[PDB]
C-alpha cells in the first residue's frame, strides 16, 4: 500500500500568461488541480514529488483561440485502498451502528455486526463507546481493520471494515 505513481495532466494556458513566469504558473496550476485530488483510478493524489524537476514539455498552440495546451508529465505519492487490505487507524465517529476509523486521508467504517458479539454499544457514555469483557473502544481508540470493500465516491473513497477476525480490532 501507499504508492508512488508516474502521472501526467493536460493544462491549457491563456495567452496572457505567455511571459517568463510561465513554467512557474504552469507548475503551480499542476499543484492546484492534482494535489489534494481524488480519483478512483489512482485514489488520493496526495503530494506531488520533485517540484524542481517537473517536465513542462512544449505547449502546442490551440488553433482558433490563442491558448496553448501542455502535457505536464509528473511523479507523486498516492493512497489507493484495497479490499482485503489490513489497516491500522483511529476512531473518529462512533454510533449505535458502528465506528468510523480514520486511515490516512480516508475513513473506514466498522459495522456493529462486523465486530465480535461480546462488543456491545454503550449509549450511556461520554463519549459513546463499544464495550467488551476486556476491551473498550471509544473515540481516540486505535484499531486494526480488515477492509471488506470500497466505494469510490467523487473526491473520496469510503470503505467497510471487519474487526471480527483474528489479530484484528483494538491495539
Amino acid at each position: 500500500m501507499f504508492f508512488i505513481k508516474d502521472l501526467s495532466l493536460n493544462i491549457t494556458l491563456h495567452p496572457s500568461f505567455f511571459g517568463p513566469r510561465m513554467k512557474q504558473y504552469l507548475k503551480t496550476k499542476l499543484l492546484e488541480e492534482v494535489e489534494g485530488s481524488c480519483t478512483g483510478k489512482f485514489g488520493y493524489i496526495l503530494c506531488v514529488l520533485d517540484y524542481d524537476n517537473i517536465d513542462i514539455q512544449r505547449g502546442r498552440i490551440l488553433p482558433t483561440d490563442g491558448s496553448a495546451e501542455f502535457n505536464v508529465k509528473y511523479r507523486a505519492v498516492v493512497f489507493k485502498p484495497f479490499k482485503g487490505e489490513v489497516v491500522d487507524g483511529t476512531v473518529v465517529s462512533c454510533s449505535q451502528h458502528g465506528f468510523e476509523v480514520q486511515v490516512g486521508p480516508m475513513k473506514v467504517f466498522v459495522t456493529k455486526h462486523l465486530m465480535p458479539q461480546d462488543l456491545t454499544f454503550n449509549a450511556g457514555s461520554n463519549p459513546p463507546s463499544y464495550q467488551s469483557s476486556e476491551d473498550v473502544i471509544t473515540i481516540k481508540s486505535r484499531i486494526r481493520v480488515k477492509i471488506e470493500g470500497c466505494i469510490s465516491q467523487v473526491s473520496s473513497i469510503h470503505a467497510i471494515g471487519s474487526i471480527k477476525e483474528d489479530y484484528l480490532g483494538a491495539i
Binding site: 478512483g40 483510478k41 488553433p63 482558433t64
Partner: protein, 97 residues
Amino acid sequence: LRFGEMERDCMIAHGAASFLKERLMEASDAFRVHICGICGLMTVIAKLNHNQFECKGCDNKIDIYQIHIPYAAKLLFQELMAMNITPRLYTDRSRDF
C-alpha cells in the same frame, strides 16, 4: 449567403485552412457535443452543472471528451445511427503512417 462547395475549393487552393474553418464553424453550424471514449458515440448524458458525466451501457462516468463539430455533422451522425450505422468518433489514433 451560400459559402458553397466551389468557394470551399478556392480556400483549399489558397491554403487558408483556418479562415475556411471559421467560415464553416464559427460563422455557421458550430456546435459542442460530449462523446464517450469507449463506444465512439454521443451517448454521453452531460449534466454540465452538477458536473455529472455518464454514458450508461458503457458504465463510463470517466472516459468522456467534449468536441466542436458542425451541427449538420452531429445530425448526419444521429441520422446514420438511425440507419443502424455506427459513426464511432475517436480522439486519438491506433494507425500511424
